[PDB]
From a paper:
ALG-2 (apoptosis-linked gene 2) is a 22-kDa protein of 191 amino acid residues containing five serially repetitive EF-hand-type helix-loop-helix Ca2+-binding motifs (EF1 to EF5) and it belongs to the penta-EF-hand (PEF) family, including the calpain small subunit, sorcin, grancalcin and peflin in mammals. ALG-2 (a gene product of PDCD6) belongs to the penta-EF-hand (PEF) protein family and Ca2+-dependently interacts with various intracellular proteins including mammalian Alix, an adaptor protein in the ESCRT system. X-ray crystal structures of various PEF proteins including ALG-2 have common features: the presence of eight α-helices and dimer formation via paired EF5s that are positioned in anti-parallel orientation. Binding of Ca2+ (or Zn2+) to EF3 enables the side chain of R125, present in the loop connecting EF3 and EF4, to move enough to make a primary hydrophobic pocket (Pocket 1) accessible to the critical PPYP motif found in Alix.
An alternatively spliced shorter isoform, designated ALG-2ΔGF122, lacks Gly121Phe122 and does not bind Alix, but the structural basis of the incompetence has remained to be elucidated. An asymmetric unit of the crystal of des3-23ALG-2ΔGF122 in the Ca2+-bound form contained two ALG-2 molecules (A and B) as a dimer. In des3-23ALG-2ΔGF122, however, the deletion of Gly121Phe122 caused loss of the third turn in α5 that corresponds to the exiting helix of EF3 (magenta). In the structure of des3-23ALG-2ΔGF122 in the Ca2+-bound form, however, NH2R123 (corresponding to NH2R125 in wild-type ALG-2) did not form such a hydrogen bond. The side chain extended outwardly from the loop as in the case of the structure of the metal-free form, but the spatial positions of the side chains between R123 and Y122 were closer in the equivalent residues in the metal-free ALG-2 (R125 and Y124). Three calcium ions were found in EF1, EF3 and EF5 of des3-23ALG-2ΔGF122 at the canonical EF-hand coordination positions (x, y, z, -y, -x and -z), though water molecules at the -x positions in EF1 and EF3 were absent and no amino acid residue coordinated at the -z position in EF5. On the other hand, the side chain directed toward Pocket 1 in Ca2+-bound des3-23ALG-2ΔGF122, but it did not fully block the entry path of Pocket 1 as in the case of metal-free ALG-2. Since S120 is located within α5 in ALG-2 but is placed at the end of the truncated helix in ALG-2ΔGF122, an α-helix-supporting hydrogen bond between OS120 and NG121 (G123 in wild type) is disrupted. This causes a change in the spatial orientation of OS120, and the hydrogen bond with NH2R125 in wild-type ALG-2 is lost in NH2R123 in ALG-2ΔGF122. The distance between the Cα atoms of Y122 and T160 (facing Pocket 1) is shorter in the crystal structure of des3-23ALG-2ΔGF122 (8.7 Å) than that between the corresponding Y124 and T162 in the Ca2+-bound (9.9 Å) and metal-free structure of des3-20ALG-2 (9.0 Å), indicating a narrower Pocket 1 in the isoform.
Residue numbers in the entry:
A (entry chain B): 28 to 189
B (entry chain A): 2, 24 to 189
Write the structure that this text describes.
Amino acid sequence: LWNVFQRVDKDRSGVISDTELQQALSNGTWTPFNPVTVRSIISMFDRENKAGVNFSEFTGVWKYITDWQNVFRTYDRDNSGMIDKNELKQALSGYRLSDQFHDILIRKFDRQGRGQIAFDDFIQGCIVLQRLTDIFRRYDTDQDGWIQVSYEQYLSMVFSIV
Amino acid sequence: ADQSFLWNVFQRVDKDRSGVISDTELQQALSNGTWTPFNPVTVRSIISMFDRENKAGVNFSEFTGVWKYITDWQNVFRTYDRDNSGMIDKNELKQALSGYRLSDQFHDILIRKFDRQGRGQIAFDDFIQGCIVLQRLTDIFRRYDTDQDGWIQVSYEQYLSMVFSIV
Ligand SMILES: [Ca+2]
Ligand SMILES: [Ca+2]
Ligand SMILES: [Ca+2]
Ligand SMILES: [Ca+2]
Ligand SMILES: [Ca+2]
Ligand SMILES: [Ca+2]
């Protein structure tokens, strides 16, 4: 791990920045790992609001990304290195989502634009879905799948998301 | 033709002379009456509204849209800042946002949400920000509130679609 951390710390400054974390990562493509995802992950582990991670926080970041990669690999059952619609259907089977909705999700998080989902966009869409579903559940106390909300509640709800 | 004096404004802002005003260039050119830099999120949104090339920036031809847009906001802002103190308070905010028919206390929620100076008033950049977000969120709400009683009822998947429209 130590050895891995120094390698990522390009300028040897003892703190891994966004840029540095991004260049250590591959989305399986010719494009950069999504800088929005790099930053969500860093702010999860950085406790001194400094847009960076030191070694002990980096052990947390690295475990987390490697665990996501394990998930990605588990469901990419043709080893194509992209999650296609039916693989996503497997991956999200615990959400009880319709076929039509998986297309919407792909449209939304697929940055490559070919109707498949790369590792970075996989992480992004999974975390967004998860955050949103939890916020939804705060309203759906009777777990019937429907909510009824006033204009003011709705706004506050969006203010709580983003 | 066309416009000589806007060109000067453009070059001052375009410090690197790349021919494109970036996010940071625009932010450094803009003032909020404060020592904290102009809301970077507000800057990015304005750039996104006028950029037709997806280059994270605006060229001269788009910048005349930017100049007009920011200037129009200055006028709306100076209009509701009735005492010309350079911040908008609850009382002023209530006047600005009449047409929304928002409850009294919701105004405090808006102030907390968007005032980054933490004094209970809203500077010019944070004012644009909340108004942009309010109008955008409201149009999305109106789409779902076909009858306009102020209520929506959505499924989980509809809820997710609606949030995807916004985020
Ligand atoms: Ca470093
Ligand atoms: Ca696959
Ligand atoms: Ca319910
Ligand atoms: Ca420039
Ligand atoms: Ca005032
Ligand atoms: Ca309604």
